[PDB]
Amino acid sequence: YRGSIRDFPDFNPSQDAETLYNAMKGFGSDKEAIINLITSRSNKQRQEICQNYKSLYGKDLIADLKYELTGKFERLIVGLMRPPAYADAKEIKDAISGIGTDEKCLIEILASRTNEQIHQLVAAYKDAYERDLEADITGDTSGHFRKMLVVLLQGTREEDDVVSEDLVQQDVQDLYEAGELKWGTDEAQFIYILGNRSKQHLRLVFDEYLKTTGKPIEASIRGELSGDFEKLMLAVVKCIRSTAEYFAERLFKAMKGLGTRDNTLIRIMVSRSELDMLDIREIFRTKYEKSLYSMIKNDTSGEYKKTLLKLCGGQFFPEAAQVAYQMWELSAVARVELKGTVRPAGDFNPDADAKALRKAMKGLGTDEDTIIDIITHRSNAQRQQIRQTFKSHFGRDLMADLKSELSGDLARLILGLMMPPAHYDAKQLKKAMEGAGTDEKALIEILATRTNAEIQAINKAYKEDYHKTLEDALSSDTSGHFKRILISLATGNREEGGEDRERAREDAQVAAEILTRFMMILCTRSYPDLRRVFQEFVKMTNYDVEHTIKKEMSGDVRDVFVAIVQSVKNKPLFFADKLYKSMKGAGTEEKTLTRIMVSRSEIDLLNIRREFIEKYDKSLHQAIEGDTSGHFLKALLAICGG
Ligand SMILES: [Ca+2]
Ligand SMILES: [Ca+2]
Ligand SMILES: [Ca+2]
Ligand SMILES: [Ca+2]
Ligand SMILES: [Ca+2]
Ligand SMILES: [Ca+2]
């Protein structure tokens, strides 16, 4: 049983109805009792209770509840009383009935519900409202989106059976040609296959597609479709692979950033409470920093929160384990292409650049707009050229002039862009260790993200600018395991070769025991090897490395390793995650925000931009646009590149 709420052992329906009656007795009601009851009984038992109540009093429990309660807390409780099928119908009703139209709800339900659930859905709609669901849907949606929805409404998807490897491969190429190989996508094609083929078949098709293409099916869909259809087709895929994972992220999305999408939270927590709530939790914790319980506890309040925490629940299983494993498989096989946001300027004229720069700095005030239009629109290399030119033209150091004429975050941003990669990092590391305390966050981000070549370049740039070895510096500002671990990474001496299934299983065993060598493995093994090592870990312990690190490590030590693991799993994502935090909350960390924007502006910033929008449903553009302002915002948005 992967549900969070199960049948209450030895339950007295008649008494429960009596307790519900007495709970609402007098002015108001004993909400603490109502929630503890309803939330401690299966939807089936709730139906019996609601039944005994109708006879024992001749009143409607749901109608009565609707009166004695109010607010989100009411929607939740009343929603928990409605039969599964009739609950879905209500959600759909609200979505297509009113002012706007919740396509998010339409997609969540229609793309996840099974053939039976779908049939029980449309039936409950016609019964509860005496209206045709297909007609209502068809008349409230347009385009391929409407089509796909109607196809999903038929609930006539071929159900699991023996897979025909011949048809699987035929579908793999069919999809490939209908999408990846073309400018756009054959909607009619994807709708038919992704909508008719069995989940078991498609799952094997998706696996085949990645192994023979290099990228997951969604990678070929993303950006190749438009509007709600893209989202819908991306949701169907996710659901086919794992509905637990779908709701896992769908949930995270409803609580992400100030303000909650309570309507989605209640719908999901209620609908999956007796299906895969447990797996969703196992996946949520693994896929995200905070646990479902923690996220809900911090986003909701009152009885509404207490109820949600009860619905939630608070080793892996066939599902939660599959996802974790497949997560590493993808990261290991996926053929990703790193792309920056700022590219070399065409018709590059250093002489004209240095002139415009010199001009925009003369006088009392400093023309910053021009300074930004140039600097932020030139590759770090071209920038180094403007420095050379500027100097060999005016006999003055551009940096010194820039540093003096500029100030604040802007000065830090602009001057940061003018510094060569290896030197910017060196400066960063030096600052993190200067003064009182250590910017543990800065050191980790860098030392746990940079490569052997990058670390080598850094180690050198450091000795120069700051006559002292990067190690010596580290030993001066840090200590303990944090220092040992950091110093290790600062050696840029990690294995480069491919994976070794032999050593892998061995290394994996080391991680299993912990639940010095571990450090060596996480600091010495090549990323491709570690990727496999983690594959073997989930296969022999049933847990994910992240869980071993969290359970046996804490604080900085735990953050360096998690940073490393994340860097090996999905570097761009790790940065998108860090970029979100910097702008998360009332304040803003222009420091981290600036460091990441600059450092990755020419490596994989575009990649980060996508991982950001996909996971937080909002472009980095708007993300920055809302936090920063003035000239700091102008320059930043320049690096973002759209
Ligand atoms: Ca009310
Ligand atoms: Ca395509
Ligand atoms: Ca929130
Ligand atoms: Ca000036
Ligand atoms: Ca310090
Ligand atoms: Ca902020």
XYZ file of C-alpha atoms and ligand atoms in Angstrom:
648
model
C 0.000 0.000 0.000
C 1.599 3.231 -1.213
C -1.184 5.420 0.141
C -0.770 7.711 3.152
C -4.228 7.115 4.617
C -5.515 3.566 5.025
C -8.714 1.941 6.301
C -9.229 2.657 9.998
C -8.990 -0.687 11.861
C -12.320 -1.538 13.484
C -14.349 1.582 12.734
C -17.820 2.508 13.953
C -19.454 4.460 11.094
C -22.616 5.193 13.079
C -20.631 6.539 16.035
C -18.326 8.556 13.784
C -21.368 10.254 12.264
C -22.549 10.961 15.806
C -19.152 12.407 16.715
C -19.272 14.598 13.611
C -22.730 15.790 14.655
C -21.626 16.674 18.189
C -18.490 18.327 16.814
C -20.603 20.897 14.971
C -22.875 21.334 17.994
C -23.121 24.838 19.425
C -21.693 28.056 18.002
C -19.053 26.987 15.510
C -17.561 23.503 15.701
C -14.749 21.357 17.094
C -12.541 21.553 14.002
C -9.750 19.696 15.802
C -12.143 16.754 16.099
C -13.617 16.989 12.596
C -10.202 16.925 10.918
C -8.803 14.212 13.181
C -11.802 12.045 12.325
C -12.257 12.482 8.572
C -8.473 12.456 8.135
C -8.256 9.183 10.081
C -10.620 7.248 7.808
C -10.481 5.976 4.232
C -12.631 7.666 1.594
C -14.670 4.457 1.602
C -15.215 4.657 5.355
C -15.996 8.359 4.981
C -18.728 7.377 2.528
C -20.235 4.970 5.047
C -20.022 7.611 7.770
C -21.660 10.196 5.511
C -24.300 7.522 4.887
C -25.064 6.727 8.530
C -25.314 10.476 9.126
C -27.939 10.876 6.398
C -30.142 8.302 8.123
C -29.281 8.914 11.780
C -30.269 12.575 11.337
C -31.880 13.044 7.935
C -29.242 15.666 7.152
C -26.512 15.971 4.513
C -23.049 15.688 6.079
C -21.382 17.538 3.203
C -24.057 20.241 3.158
C -23.798 20.548 6.934
C -19.999 20.709 6.770
C -20.163 23.407 4.101
C -22.154 25.523 6.554
C -20.172 25.027 9.767
C -16.866 25.528 7.932
C -15.364 28.158 5.627
C -12.191 28.977 3.701
C -9.567 26.688 2.187
C -10.058 24.458 5.225
C -13.619 23.828 4.043
C -12.644 22.981 0.465
C -10.204 20.412 1.847
C -12.579 18.755 4.321
C -15.570 18.769 1.962
C -13.312 17.599 -0.845
C -12.254 14.672 1.334
C -15.885 13.586 1.713
C -16.723 13.499 -1.997
C -16.230 10.131 -3.734
C -12.993 9.975 -5.802
C -14.841 10.240 -9.127
C -17.212 12.984 -7.974
C -14.279 14.917 -6.527
C -12.486 14.981 -9.878
C -15.660 16.104 -11.648
C -15.915 19.034 -9.239
C -12.334 20.111 -9.923
C -12.979 19.927 -13.665
C -16.203 21.888 -13.218
C -14.475 24.758 -11.410
C -11.696 24.739 -14.007
C -13.957 25.202 -17.035
C -16.718 27.057 -15.175
C -16.219 30.676 -14.183
C -14.037 33.531 -15.395
C -10.742 32.085 -16.588
C -9.918 28.428 -17.184
C -7.501 26.336 -15.128
C -5.619 24.435 -17.827
C -3.182 23.371 -15.109
C -5.980 21.391 -13.461
C -7.300 20.092 -16.782
C -3.806 18.846 -17.628
C -3.089 17.399 -14.181
C -6.255 15.286 -14.099
C -6.714 14.324 -17.755
C -3.046 13.361 -18.118
C -2.783 11.291 -14.927
C -6.127 9.523 -14.473
C -6.376 5.980 -15.843
C -8.931 4.556 -18.280
C -11.210 3.545 -15.404
C -10.753 6.782 -13.457
C -11.495 8.687 -16.662
C -14.669 6.702 -17.336
C -15.824 7.161 -13.744
C -14.931 10.831 -14.177
C -17.093 11.645 -17.204
C -19.912 9.574 -15.709
C -19.791 11.477 -12.420
C -19.842 14.730 -14.389
C -23.011 13.872 -16.312
C -24.621 12.659 -13.090
C -23.583 15.453 -10.729
C -24.222 18.209 -13.281
C -26.253 16.624 -16.080
C -23.766 18.053 -18.574
C -21.549 16.489 -21.238
C -17.888 16.688 -20.225
C -16.525 16.239 -23.748
C -18.867 18.915 -25.098
C -17.905 21.283 -22.281
C -14.197 20.578 -22.770
C -14.442 20.817 -26.557
C -16.166 24.166 -26.110
C -13.681 25.561 -23.596
C -10.384 24.564 -25.205
C -8.930 25.057 -28.685
C -6.235 23.638 -30.941
C -4.188 20.474 -30.503
C -4.605 21.033 -26.770
C -8.343 20.448 -27.121
C -7.661 17.381 -29.268
C -5.187 15.705 -26.911
C -7.628 16.368 -24.071
C -10.517 14.704 -25.906
C -8.289 11.752 -26.791
C -7.446 11.362 -23.106
C -11.152 11.655 -22.288
C -12.068 8.531 -24.260
C -10.019 6.538 -21.777
C -9.431 3.922 -24.457
C -5.652 3.649 -24.165
C -4.405 0.139 -24.914
C -3.803 -1.309 -21.450
C -0.641 -3.162 -20.404
C 0.227 -6.496 -22.020
C 3.244 -8.153 -23.652
C 5.411 -5.576 -25.422
C 6.234 -6.051 -29.106
C 9.842 -4.887 -29.463
C 9.073 -4.530 -33.173
C 6.397 -1.887 -32.597
C 8.400 -0.240 -29.817
C 11.322 0.404 -32.159
C 8.881 1.459 -34.878
C 7.446 4.057 -32.506
C 10.902 5.243 -31.457
C 11.878 6.151 -35.015
C 8.355 7.367 -35.796
C 8.592 9.822 -32.896
C 12.182 10.753 -33.734
C 11.320 11.669 -37.320
C 8.030 13.311 -36.331
C 9.870 15.563 -33.907
C 13.623 15.825 -33.337
C 14.394 15.550 -37.060
C 12.124 18.471 -37.962
C 11.594 22.185 -37.410
C 8.509 21.902 -35.232
C 6.538 18.777 -34.354
C 3.961 16.418 -35.845
C 1.240 16.975 -33.236
C -1.121 14.454 -34.834
C 1.696 11.916 -34.575
C 2.613 12.414 -30.914
C -1.037 12.602 -29.855
C -1.819 9.222 -31.422
C 1.125 7.279 -29.977
C 1.567 9.057 -26.643
C -2.191 8.773 -26.256
C -3.000 5.235 -27.389
C -0.008 2.980 -26.682
C 0.064 1.279 -23.278
C 2.043 2.807 -20.414
C 4.208 -0.322 -20.314
C 4.927 -0.064 -24.044
C 5.611 3.678 -24.125
C 7.859 3.369 -21.068
C 10.032 1.000 -23.096
C 9.765 3.374 -26.051
C 11.007 6.284 -23.946
C 13.904 4.172 -22.679
C 14.750 3.133 -26.237
C 14.499 6.697 -27.527
C 17.096 7.954 -25.042
C 19.476 5.044 -25.628
C 19.327 5.411 -29.416
C 18.965 9.202 -29.633
C 21.014 10.649 -26.792
C 18.227 12.769 -25.326
C 14.941 12.041 -23.504
C 11.682 12.361 -25.446
C 10.694 15.513 -23.542
C 13.963 17.075 -24.688
C 12.683 16.782 -28.255
C 9.254 18.133 -27.299
C 10.377 21.146 -25.265
C 10.477 24.278 -27.395
C 9.165 22.305 -30.365
C 5.537 22.898 -29.387
C 3.575 25.912 -28.150
C 1.416 27.085 -25.270
C -0.704 24.765 -23.148
C -0.193 21.927 -25.632
C 3.532 21.708 -24.897
C 2.805 21.602 -21.166
C 0.062 19.020 -21.690
C 2.250 16.763 -23.836
C 5.089 17.129 -21.330
C 2.722 16.195 -18.508
C 1.408 13.099 -20.282
C 4.968 11.854 -20.730
C 5.862 12.436 -17.080
C 2.678 10.658 -16.001
C 3.374 7.704 -18.298
C 6.823 7.387 -16.735
C 5.772 8.061 -13.142
C 2.647 9.795 -11.835
C 4.223 9.890 -8.380
C 7.063 12.010 -9.747
C 4.612 14.192 -11.658
C 2.591 15.046 -8.562
C 5.866 15.316 -6.656
C 6.928 18.313 -8.741
C 3.393 19.562 -9.396
C 3.167 19.859 -5.615
C 6.518 21.628 -5.273
C 5.267 24.104 -7.877
C 2.120 24.881 -5.876
C 4.212 25.868 -2.850
C 7.206 27.397 -4.641
C 7.809 31.041 -3.731
C 5.597 33.175 -1.472
C 1.903 32.467 -2.007
C 0.354 29.023 -2.394
C -1.776 27.467 -5.126
C -3.965 25.909 -2.428
C -6.528 24.705 -4.977
C -3.883 22.457 -6.536
C -2.418 21.469 -3.169
C -5.779 20.287 -1.846
C -6.647 18.527 -5.106
C -3.372 16.583 -5.166
C -3.113 15.784 -1.449
C -6.703 14.524 -1.534
C -6.642 12.566 -4.804
C -3.321 10.770 -4.242
C -3.761 10.162 -0.504
C -4.881 6.575 -1.125
C -2.803 5.866 -4.228
C 0.894 6.781 -4.169
C 1.239 9.530 -1.557
C 4.054 7.530 0.043
C 6.047 7.244 -3.183
C 5.428 10.917 -3.951
C 7.014 11.722 -0.591
C 10.004 9.453 -1.191
C 10.504 11.180 -4.545
C 9.838 14.706 -3.261
C 12.501 14.395 -0.557
C 15.004 13.032 -3.076
C 14.202 15.509 -5.853
C 14.025 18.509 -3.520
C 15.837 19.932 -0.498
C 12.818 20.023 1.818
C 10.416 17.150 2.467
C 6.755 17.349 1.461
C 5.927 17.593 5.163
C 8.300 20.517 5.724
C 7.209 22.449 2.631
C 3.530 22.089 3.546
C 4.116 22.943 7.207
C 5.788 26.224 6.228
C 3.363 27.241 3.485
C 0.046 26.539 5.213
C -1.458 27.353 8.618
C -4.410 26.742 10.929
C -6.496 23.576 10.674
C -6.018 23.690 6.907
C -2.317 23.084 7.540
C -2.917 20.444 10.210
C -5.193 18.562 7.814
C -2.714 18.736 4.937
C 0.053 17.499 7.235
C -2.216 14.603 8.197
C -3.052 13.768 4.584
C 0.662 13.802 3.780
C 1.638 11.458 6.592
C 4.966 12.664 7.931
C 14.286 2.403 2.119
C 12.775 3.061 -1.305
C 10.018 1.161 -3.091
C 9.679 -0.128 -6.701
C 8.530 3.342 -7.788
C 10.535 5.838 -5.719
C 13.609 3.690 -6.360
C 13.013 3.492 -10.110
C 12.910 7.282 -10.436
C 16.113 7.821 -8.449
C 17.936 5.240 -10.566
C 16.536 6.523 -13.865
C 17.527 10.021 -12.749
C 21.195 9.022 -12.778
C 20.826 6.952 -15.941
C 19.566 10.035 -17.770
C 22.369 12.229 -16.435
C 24.856 9.573 -17.544
C 23.519 8.989 -21.063
C 21.856 12.276 -22.063
C 23.847 14.059 -24.779
C 23.707 17.611 -23.423
C 25.051 20.688 -25.208
C 26.298 23.515 -22.987
C 25.468 27.024 -24.193
C 26.238 30.458 -22.795
C 24.078 33.567 -23.131
C 26.598 36.203 -24.211
C 28.421 35.651 -27.503
C 31.297 37.516 -29.230
C 30.204 40.774 -30.859
C 30.329 40.947 -34.643
C 32.337 43.660 -36.388
C 34.322 43.924 -33.158
C 36.352 47.138 -33.009
C 38.408 47.397 -29.787
C 39.612 50.881 -30.735
C 36.038 52.155 -31.034
C 35.127 50.359 -27.811
C 37.962 51.752 -25.693
C 37.034 55.191 -27.028
C 33.360 54.933 -26.074
C 34.446 53.668 -22.658
C 36.925 56.500 -22.126
C 34.296 59.018 -23.229
C 31.603 57.615 -20.931
C 33.908 58.030 -17.926
C 35.151 61.584 -18.475
C 33.590 64.412 -16.482
C 32.100 64.337 -12.988
C 29.342 61.821 -13.628
C 29.909 58.490 -15.352
C 27.869 57.429 -18.390
C 27.032 53.932 -17.149
C 24.477 53.017 -19.821
C 27.124 53.078 -22.553
C 29.543 51.233 -20.272
C 26.952 48.462 -19.989
C 25.894 48.317 -23.647
C 29.493 47.455 -24.531
C 30.930 45.353 -21.691
C 27.877 43.112 -21.234
C 27.763 42.511 -24.990
C 31.291 41.208 -25.569
C 32.898 37.820 -24.940
C 35.351 37.768 -22.032
C 38.054 37.388 -24.681
C 36.945 40.451 -26.642
C 36.865 42.236 -23.290
C 40.504 41.337 -22.664
C 41.099 42.948 -26.049
C 39.393 46.206 -25.084
C 41.696 46.209 -22.060
C 44.779 45.714 -24.229
C 43.640 48.375 -26.691
C 42.536 50.855 -24.026
C 45.959 50.566 -22.398
C 47.992 50.650 -25.617
C 45.976 53.737 -26.564
C 45.686 55.937 -23.466
C 48.443 54.428 -21.352
C 45.821 53.896 -18.655
C 44.459 50.744 -17.016
C 40.785 50.315 -17.912
C 40.056 48.334 -14.743
C 41.423 51.059 -12.460
C 39.317 53.587 -14.363
C 36.262 51.325 -14.229
C 36.729 50.553 -10.537
C 36.981 54.249 -9.674
C 34.181 55.538 -11.907
C 31.775 52.717 -11.001
C 30.322 51.744 -7.613
C 28.030 49.273 -5.866
C 26.754 45.968 -7.226
C 27.133 47.391 -10.730
C 30.837 48.070 -10.208
C 31.211 44.513 -8.922
C 29.266 43.118 -11.885
C 31.023 45.110 -14.609
C 34.486 44.692 -13.095
C 33.667 41.016 -12.711
C 32.900 40.625 -16.409
C 36.176 42.337 -17.327
C 38.187 39.761 -15.376
C 39.377 36.593 -17.139
C 37.630 33.382 -15.937
C 40.542 31.952 -13.926
C 41.159 35.315 -12.252
C 37.540 36.075 -11.378
C 37.339 32.774 -9.501
C 40.634 33.509 -7.753
C 39.261 36.888 -6.685
C 36.040 35.252 -5.504
C 37.842 32.620 -3.433
C 40.115 35.279 -1.938
C 37.168 37.441 -0.869
C 35.354 34.481 0.684
C 38.385 33.890 2.917
C 39.140 37.542 3.695
C 37.914 39.268 6.851
C 36.101 37.609 9.758
C 34.437 34.271 9.037
C 34.305 32.237 5.832
C 31.864 32.469 2.930
C 31.495 28.685 2.995
C 28.822 29.040 0.305
C 31.179 30.744 -2.155
C 34.053 28.285 -1.738
C 31.790 25.257 -2.170
C 29.961 26.588 -5.230
C 33.303 27.193 -6.951
C 35.550 24.372 -5.716
C 32.748 21.825 -6.146
C 31.824 23.001 -9.642
C 35.092 23.812 -11.419
C 37.018 21.263 -13.484
C 40.639 20.095 -13.294
C 41.627 22.552 -16.023
C 39.626 25.352 -14.413
C 41.037 24.595 -10.960
C 44.553 24.521 -12.406
C 44.042 27.892 -14.082
C 42.636 29.161 -10.785
C 45.477 27.807 -8.641
C 47.855 29.669 -10.951
C 45.910 32.931 -11.162
C 45.847 32.868 -7.362
C 49.594 32.565 -6.773
C 49.961 35.541 -9.114
C 47.378 38.082 -7.939
C 47.806 36.949 -4.336
C 51.330 35.642 -3.814
C 50.292 32.486 -1.968
C 49.079 29.018 -2.983
C 45.322 28.418 -3.082
C 45.874 25.629 -0.557
C 47.873 27.748 1.887
C 45.064 30.300 1.776
C 42.486 27.608 2.517
C 44.468 26.305 5.495
C 44.534 29.872 6.820
C 40.792 30.571 6.860
C 39.283 27.112 7.339
C 39.848 23.929 9.333
C 38.381 20.543 10.199
C 36.837 18.256 7.595
C 35.584 21.254 5.619
C 39.190 22.312 5.034
C 40.392 18.805 4.179
C 37.562 18.359 1.680
C 37.994 21.804 0.122
C 41.780 21.495 -0.154
C 41.226 18.179 -1.931
C 39.055 19.787 -4.607
C 41.493 22.697 -4.901
C 44.061 20.269 -6.316
C 42.320 19.917 -9.667
C 43.643 16.363 -9.703
C 40.545 14.268 -10.415
C 40.419 11.166 -12.614
C 39.269 11.834 -16.181
C 38.810 8.375 -17.678
C 35.459 6.727 -18.275
C 33.532 4.603 -15.783
C 34.772 1.302 -14.359
C 31.888 -0.978 -13.358
C 34.529 -2.892 -11.396
C 35.695 -0.122 -9.059
C 32.175 1.327 -9.140
C 30.411 -1.463 -7.242
C 33.323 -1.344 -4.798
C 33.084 2.409 -4.249
C 29.316 2.007 -3.942
C 29.894 -0.470 -1.115
C 31.915 2.182 0.712
C 28.930 4.535 0.626
C 26.709 1.708 1.858
C 28.943 1.145 4.897
C 28.880 4.778 6.013
C 25.106 4.403 6.368
C 38.143 9.435 4.406
C 37.557 6.897 1.632
C 34.185 8.450 0.825
C 35.871 11.827 0.404
C 38.486 10.276 -1.875
C 35.727 8.753 -3.998
C 33.705 11.973 -4.209
C 36.856 14.036 -4.781
C 38.973 11.709 -6.935
C 36.588 9.722 -9.145
C 35.625 11.073 -12.561
C 32.055 12.335 -12.890
C 31.135 9.547 -15.347
C 32.338 6.936 -12.848
C 30.535 8.518 -9.898
C 27.356 8.573 -11.991
C 27.534 4.792 -12.279
C 28.638 4.417 -8.657
C 25.381 6.077 -7.611
C 23.465 3.788 -9.963
C 24.905 0.799 -8.122
C 24.216 2.438 -4.765
C 20.456 2.653 -5.292
C 20.628 -0.893 -6.655
C 22.264 -2.353 -3.538
C 20.980 -0.179 -0.681
C 17.673 1.043 -2.115
C 18.563 4.604 -1.103
C 20.088 7.543 -2.974
C 23.557 8.885 -2.134
C 21.919 12.134 -1.032
C 20.201 10.189 1.742
C 23.491 8.687 2.922
C 25.161 12.102 3.005
C 22.253 13.732 4.841
C 21.931 10.938 7.439
C 25.695 10.734 8.147
C 26.859 14.291 7.422
C 25.769 17.785 8.448
C 26.456 21.469 7.869
C 29.269 22.494 5.535
C 30.606 18.945 5.213
C 27.144 17.856 4.062
C 26.845 20.812 1.688
C 30.160 20.219 -0.108
C 29.261 16.610 -0.868
C 25.699 17.428 -1.903
C 27.124 20.193 -4.081
C 29.502 17.675 -5.651
C 26.784 15.068 -6.209
C 24.496 17.732 -7.665
C 27.330 18.996 -9.858
C 27.750 15.467 -11.211
C 24.003 14.956 -11.648
C 22.992 18.211 -13.339
C 25.376 21.170 -13.094
C 23.083 23.685 -14.852
C 20.259 22.777 -12.470
C 22.528 23.248 -9.450
C 23.179 26.812 -10.601
C 19.531 27.490 -11.416
C 18.739 26.307 -7.893
C 21.372 28.612 -6.401
C 20.218 31.511 -8.580
C 16.658 31.058 -7.333
C 17.737 31.149 -3.687
C 19.716 34.360 -4.200
C 16.491 36.053 -5.305
C 14.322 34.072 -2.891
C 12.897 35.923 0.098
C 12.490 39.632 0.823
C 16.183 40.359 0.365
C 18.560 39.542 -2.482
C 22.113 38.228 -2.619
C 23.514 40.312 -5.466
C 26.866 38.710 -4.649
C 25.905 35.122 -5.480
C 23.510 36.361 -8.162
C 26.377 38.260 -9.795
C 28.975 35.503 -9.407
C 26.823 32.815 -11.066
C 25.598 35.153 -13.834
C 29.159 36.140 -14.745
C 31.048 32.867 -14.257
C 28.539 30.867 -16.325
C 27.591 33.587 -18.815
C 29.752 31.885 -21.452
C 29.651 28.230 -20.375
C 26.076 27.070 -19.795
C 23.996 30.063 -18.693
C 21.374 29.308 -21.343
C 21.181 25.757 -20.006
C 20.686 27.186 -16.519
C 17.982 29.480 -17.886
C 15.882 26.481 -18.947
C 16.368 24.429 -15.781
C 15.216 27.575 -13.988
C 11.975 28.133 -15.908
C 11.070 24.438 -15.989
C 11.459 23.992 -12.228
C 10.141 27.385 -11.101
C 7.677 28.244 -13.883
C 9.250 31.667 -14.434
C 12.056 33.022 -16.610
C 15.296 34.181 -14.999
C 14.495 37.431 -16.792
C 11.355 38.056 -14.741
C 13.109 36.552 -11.722
C 15.831 39.201 -11.892
C 13.478 41.869 -13.249
C 11.547 41.614 -9.997
C 14.431 41.572 -7.555
C 17.111 43.871 -8.962
C 16.542 47.349 -10.392
C 18.253 50.419 -11.808
C 21.576 49.880 -13.562
C 22.320 46.610 -11.765
C 19.159 45.219 -13.353
C 20.035 46.601 -16.786
C 23.505 45.043 -16.799
C 22.270 41.728 -15.395
C 19.465 41.429 -17.949
C 22.141 42.083 -20.568
C 24.082 38.979 -19.547
C 20.881 36.934 -19.313
C 20.427 37.445 -23.044
C 16.645 37.263 -23.119
Ca -19.267 28.388 4.522
Ca 11.117 18.880 -32.999
Ca 4.426 29.481 -1.241
Ca 32.835 60.742 -14.217
Ca 37.895 35.215 6.412
Ca 14.353 39.114 -3.100
